[PDB]
Amino acid sequence: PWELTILHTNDVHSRLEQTSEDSSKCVDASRCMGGVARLFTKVQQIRRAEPNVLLLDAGDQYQGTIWFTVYKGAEVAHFMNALRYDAMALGNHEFDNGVEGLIEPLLKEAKFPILSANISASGPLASQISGLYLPYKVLPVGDEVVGIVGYTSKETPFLSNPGTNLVFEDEITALQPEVDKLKTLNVNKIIALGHSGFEMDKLIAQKVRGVDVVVGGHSNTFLYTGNPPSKEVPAGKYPFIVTSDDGRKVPVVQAYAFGKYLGYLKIEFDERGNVISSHGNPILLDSSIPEDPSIKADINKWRIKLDDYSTQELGKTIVYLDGSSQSCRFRECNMGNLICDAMINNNLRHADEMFWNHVSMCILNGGGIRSPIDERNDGTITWENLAAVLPFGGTFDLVQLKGSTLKKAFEHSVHRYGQSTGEFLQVGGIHVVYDLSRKPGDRVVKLDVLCTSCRVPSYDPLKMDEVYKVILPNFLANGGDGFQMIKDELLRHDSGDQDINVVSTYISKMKVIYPAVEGRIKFS
Amino acid sequence: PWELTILHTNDVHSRLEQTSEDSSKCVDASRCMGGVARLFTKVQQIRRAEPNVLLLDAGDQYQGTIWFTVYKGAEVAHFMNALRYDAMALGNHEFDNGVEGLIEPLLKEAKFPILSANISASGPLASQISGLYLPYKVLPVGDEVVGIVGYTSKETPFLSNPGTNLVFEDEITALQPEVDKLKTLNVNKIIALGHSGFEMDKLIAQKVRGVDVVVGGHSNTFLYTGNPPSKEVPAGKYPFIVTSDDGRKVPVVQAYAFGKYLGYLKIEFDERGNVISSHGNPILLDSSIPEDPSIKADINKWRIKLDDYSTQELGKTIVYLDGSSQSCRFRECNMGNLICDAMINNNLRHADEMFWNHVSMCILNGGGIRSPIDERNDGTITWENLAAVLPFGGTFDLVQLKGSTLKKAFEHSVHRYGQSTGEFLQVGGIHVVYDLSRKPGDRVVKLDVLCTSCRVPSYDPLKMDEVYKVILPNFLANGGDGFQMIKDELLRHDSGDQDINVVSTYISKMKVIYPAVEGRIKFS
Ligand SMILES: Nc1ncnc2c1ncn2[C@@H]1O[C@H](COP(=O)(O)O)[C@@H](O)[C@H]1O
Ligand SMILES: Nc1ncnc2c1ncn2[C@@H]1O[C@H](COP(=O)(O)O)[C@@H](O)[C@H]1O
Ligand SMILES: [Ca+2]
Ligand SMILES: [Ca+2]
Ligand SMILES: [Zn+2]
Ligand SMILES: [Zn+2]
Ligand SMILES: [Zn+2]
Ligand SMILES: [Zn+2]
């Protein structure tokens, strides 16, 4: 049999440095995980041992830490080139800086192919970008070849800033003719590498004839065979076996996110490229694996410009930014309003004639706001100041919630009001009135929401059966602060931009800010 | 006797072209007035006839039309140089583009002295600006000399953008030692030329010993001896005679605004520089005076870049901008909210530790909003589009109003509700609730206002005895739309920036706008 070792990462999201167990800042080095210097050690060890190795990335290297804010993808090309990645699929967050922010730092500087079969360009962009990403690449591996076919979330226009000159086609529709073309070119081993999420990965494995393996991402899916090595709870076995429409067993893999794990799948192929067997497991990149000293020293050199950037003025405030618990856990606070306005600004995407913007609404746990910012330092706001407000390394995500779910979340917001608890919600595009004399669960007396399917934004009563898009912290999307109804009832969840970066970009855009408390939250 | 003819302009406010009778756009050329080409004809005629002539400007050439938006003061230096002005005092609006926007287009390019005795600089600015404006200039006139001593409103920090490196001193305190110094240098004829308003001009005439004549501005004061030639109603005789503390009769002059009139005062001096007599009147620059063909042709050449600018994209909207009468005369309209947000943004000035900003509040007659803007032209907004919304050539002014006055204005706003009348008010920094079932004059049931003397802006009930700063159209400050209570009860009024320019700057700053209707105005 011909044996291939697939090593794979996805949704690394700017975790160039080692992290804590929860993928936020590394505080206790001896317990820290991931980062590219540790990944280099482990990939080097595996490449010593296994003859036929591919190292693949399923997208979303962009967006997540100050590394991306400052280096804008140059860090991705540089450190993925140092690791000698064999191929990468485009993720949604590779469009966060527009097509121009993908072409210049990443497509022009990567020394490996960057893939997506379901993105097409029109106009002058088509000539500008031609061949800078590819539908597939055929790579030599020992004396064999392997075809790698890329794909990217059809939803990317709602989840990033790709512009109006790219079209994201249905994945399966685009992939099939490319896979059939590779078989006519005598390429009998085919990996589908792409960035649409675990549910679409299973559909691709099921329906795209000739795909042997699916390496996916986007959904931060953790798969494992056995007792899990850390806190992540598996969504299924590694690999996840799909039975294809033509009767083949097709492994589907993913490797969580944030560079915490290295995916590792061993495939045995027969002479005709049929999979005989597949087995493996993600490897937890814990402190038992040393950081490569060379890569670490390069990371430490690149860190200097981050430390310099962290104390630069982003913009000014002329108002005290009240991020105190005594305000933000009890009533509308102007820091809360600022953060939710930045969250809605971050989620302005290209719109139909059918909506002014696809999302208008924001909730934010007040316990997630961890500092005020004083305006008496000549009004300056720095990244360092924002990192005190937002220290947890979260994201501002996009969910779809029925009105009934969101009414339950606002009841939960005040169910035990008066204890300085974190679940009290700050808001944008929502006006809420509580009556704290009512029974817990019946305290919301008015709840009005800003329309999306309207040319003039205005407020209407929340409808229990209607599904709303909402921007909220990943902490809440995952049921933090007791919001089990959000986790259990949400209809869609896509991870968004780094919390600090959302607020820093908005302050930079606005130059001078003066958020008010204006009656988004009232008590009767 | 030695006879001097003083020709003088003030508060020209970018009226380079001839205007209508009300100083807005010229529509019927045969009835149009002012403009620099007509002023040139009349000044040339007077200089043929009178041996001893000074042509003086008392400030506020900057700000008023698209000329200033595009040329940023280059037009002022160029056309005041073509008219051969002898001297200009700095006005408050000469600081609208900061000190840098005064130094580069105007102070470096004017071929006449620019004066102010009561502005001092500190730090590196002092060395940068030294001698580019002067406290006074001694000018030869025939075989005599005349001293011209400048002054500028002490209030300029609240009325423009001078920065924190200039100090505006009390006028009389600064002027006196300069006037006494000129008398020690055998300069016995002294004109005080400056920009503080008619009330301060009278105080200067009264209290600054040795001033022979005061030529003023800022307050747009029209003075006339006799039956007035047009629609402006005189505030007093021309000249206005002040009896000085030392017993002299000191003429005070001003010449309205907008280049409609040329001030003309004849002074007879004795050998010791004592005024024997003074007489004159402003000259209405009507269509009986021909536009100089050379200056007109130069104006027409400079107009090309204005016409080009007028159709350039300033920014984008993703929302319909609802400037319809059916909205803006009946309820909160999002165009109204946009314009009032731009008015408050325009009035962000340097603040104490005592306020986040000196003004927080805005009212705008809904009948003053004359068009919507459709978002379906790729979202583009041009100056031409804004000029359809705001066609009247007004300004957004700063007034001080007692709470009682403003409550009367909100009652007037709905006194005859339901007829599509213009007085219905759009707002910023005010939340109002009407109950239209109540009697006219008793329909305002809640009126809350955004604090200024606060580090976190928030809303509190309006207080009847408290004096509020409010930004509002000059049309309303002057009692338009029946707001006689505003005109009759206001405590302070300063003219502000051109209406169109306020909105264009805000849209340019914001890049992408999405104003909502959000409950600033409600009906019970
Ligand atoms: N990882 C997290 N992301 C966001 N908010 C968090 C996170 N961890 C804790 N919080 C917030 O912090 C509050 C607890 O803060 P404290 O009462 O100061 O210990 C919780 O109720 C949450 O609102
Ligand atoms: N010069 C002006 N400046 C501002 N608003 C004005 C001016 N002239 C008229 N208006 C407004 O136009 C309304 C009359 O418009 P209309 O009913 O369309 O004739 C008035 O009630 C005012 O609100
Ligand atoms: Ca095969
Ligand atoms: Ca004298
Ligand atoms: Zn991701
Ligand atoms: Zn993704
Ligand atoms: Zn003026
Ligand atoms: Zn002025």
State whether B88 and B212 are in the same domain. Answer: yes
Whether B309 has its CB under 8 Å from any CB of chain A: the answer is no
Ligand nearest to the CA of A324: 1
* Three-state DSSP state, B159: helix
CB contact under 8 A, B351 and A318: yes
Nearest CA to ligand 1 atom 20: A422
Resolution in A: 1.5
CA-nearest residue to A451 within chain B is B516
Q: In what order do the strands lie in the sheet with A521-523?
A: A459-461, A444-450, A430-434, A521-523
CA distance B166 to B90: 13
Give the one of A348, A357, A514 whose C-beta lies nearest to B356's C-beta: A514
| Nearest-angstrom CA–CA distance, B410 and B442 | 10
Confirm or reject contact between A374 and chain B (CB < 8 A): no
CATH code for position B201 = 3.60.21.10
From chain B, the residues in CB contact with A505 under 8 A are: none
How far is residue B426 CA from its own chain's centroid? 23
Nearest C-alpha of chain A: how many angstroms from B443? 22
A317 and A272 in a common domain: no
Those residues whose C-beta lies under 8 Å from the C-beta of residue A148, and which sit 6 or more positions away, are A54, A56, A86, A87, A113, A115, A136, A137, A138, A139, A190, A191, A193
State the helix-helix crossing angle for A293-310 and A74-83, rounded to 10 degrees. Answer: 170
The ligand minimizing its distance to the Cα of A155 is 6
Residue B30: closest CA among B229, B391, B291, B302: B291
How far is ligand 2, taken at its centre, from the CA of residue B398, in Å? 20
Q: Which positions in chain B touch A518 (Cβ < 8 Å)?
A: 458-459
Nearest-Cα distance to chain B for A320, in Å, is 5
Structurally, chain B folds into a number of domains equal to 2
Q: Where are the alpha helices (DSSP H) in B132-232?
A: 156-159, 171-184, 198-207
Using what technique was this structure determined? X-ray
| A375 and A261 assigned to the same domain | no
CB–CB contact A516 B318 (8 Å): no
Ligand 5 centroid–CA A493 distance in Å is: 11
- Residues in A touching B319 (Cβ below 8 Å): 356, 455-457
Residues B208 and B310 in one domain: no
Q: Give the residue on A whose Cα is nearest the Cα of B429.
A: A518
Distance of CA B245 to the CA centre of its chain: 31
Do you know the residue count of chain B?
524
Rounded Cα distance, B298 and B40, in Å: 12
Three-state SS for A346-411 is: HCCCCCCCCCCCCCCEEEEEHHHCCCCECCCCCCEEEHHHHHHHCCCCCEEEEEEEEHHHHHHHHH
Q: Measured between alpha carbons, how far is A3 from B385 in angstroms, rounded to an integer? A: 67
Q: How far apart are the first and last CA of chain B?
A: 74
Domain containing B247 equals: 5-304
Mind giving me the DSSP string for A215-276? E--SS-----SSS-SSSPPPSS-SSEEEEPTTS-EEEEE---STTSEEEEEEEEE-TTS-EE
Same domain flag for B292 and B326: no
Ligand 2 pocket: which of B475, B476, B478 to mutate (most atoms within 8 A of CB): B475
The radius of gyration of chain A's CA atoms, rounded to the nearest angstrom, is: 24
Q: B207 in helix, strand or coil?
A: helix
Q: How far apart are CA A113 and CA B524, in angstroms?
A: 64
Could you give the angle at which helices B293-310 and B36-49 cross, rounded to 10 degrees? 160
Q: Which residues contact A424 (CB under 8 A, 6 or more apart)?
A: A328, A329, A330, A365, A366, A367, A413, A414, A417
Mutate to test the pocket of ligand 2, among B22, B327, B330, B392 (most ligand atoms within 8 A of CB): B392
Beta bridge partners of A214: A192, A252
Taking contacts as CB-CB distances below 8 angstroms, the residues of chain B near A356 are 318-320, 375, 514
Task: Tell me, yes or no, whether A474 and A452 share the same domain.
Answer: yes
Q: Quick one: A24 and A40 in the same domain?
A: yes
Q: Which among A459, A511, A514 has CB closest to B518?
A: A459
Q: Which of A304, A322, A337 is the last residue of a domain?
A: A304
State the smallest CA–CA distance between residue A65 and chain B in angstroms. Answer: 26
Ligand nearest to the CA of B367: 2
Q: Which of B320, B348, B431 sits opposite A456 (nearest CB)?
A: B320
Which residue ranges have their beta carbon within 6 Å of ligand 2? B 365, 367-368, 392, 394, 422, 473, 475, 481
Q: Are residues A249 and A330 in the same domain?
A: no
Give A-chain residues touching B450 at CB under 8 angstroms.
516
> For residue A456, which of A365, A357, A330 has the smallest C-alpha distance?
A357
Q: What is the DSSP string of B79-128?
A: HHHHHT-SEEEPPGGGGTTTTHHHIIIIITT-SS-EE-SSEEE-HHHHHH
Q: Residue A348: which of B334, B512, B518 has the nearest Cβ?
A: B512
Strand order across the beta sheet in which A136-141 lies:
A136-141, A144-152, A190-195, A213-215, A249-253, A240-243
Q: Is A248 exposed, middle or buried (0-12, 13-18, 19+ CB in 10 A)?
A: middle
Best mutation target, A448, A449, A455, to test chain B (most B CBs within 10 A): A455
Q: Are A370 and A325 in contact (CB under 8 A)?
A: no
CB atoms A519 and B318 under 8 Å: no
Residues from chain A that touch B318, judged by Cβ atoms under 8 A, are 348, 351, 356-357
User: Of B254, B286, B304, at which residue does a domain stop?
Assistant: B304
Q: Are the beta carbons of A423 and A482 closer than 8 angstroms?
A: yes
Q: Does A111 touch chain B (CB under 8 A)?
A: no
Considering the domain architecture, whether residues A192 and A96 belong to the same structural domain is answered as yes
Mutate to test the pocket of ligand 2, among B21, B326, B364, B365 (most ligand atoms within 8 A of CB): B365
Residue showing tokens 């995407």: A349
Q: Are residues A174 and A42 in the same domain?
A: yes
Instruction: Examine the domain organization and report whether B283 and B327 are in the same domain.
Output: no
The last residue of one of the domains, among A304, A327, A352, is: A304
CATH number of the domain where residue B335 is located: 3.90.780.10
From chain A residues 415-444, the ones with a CB under 8 A of any chain B CB are: 431
Domain co-membership, B289 together with B357? no
Residue among A204, A229, A220, A242 nearest A281 (CA): A229
For ligand 1, residues with CB inside 6 Å are A 365, 367-368, 392, 394, 422, 473, 475, 481
The SS3 call for residue A140 is strand
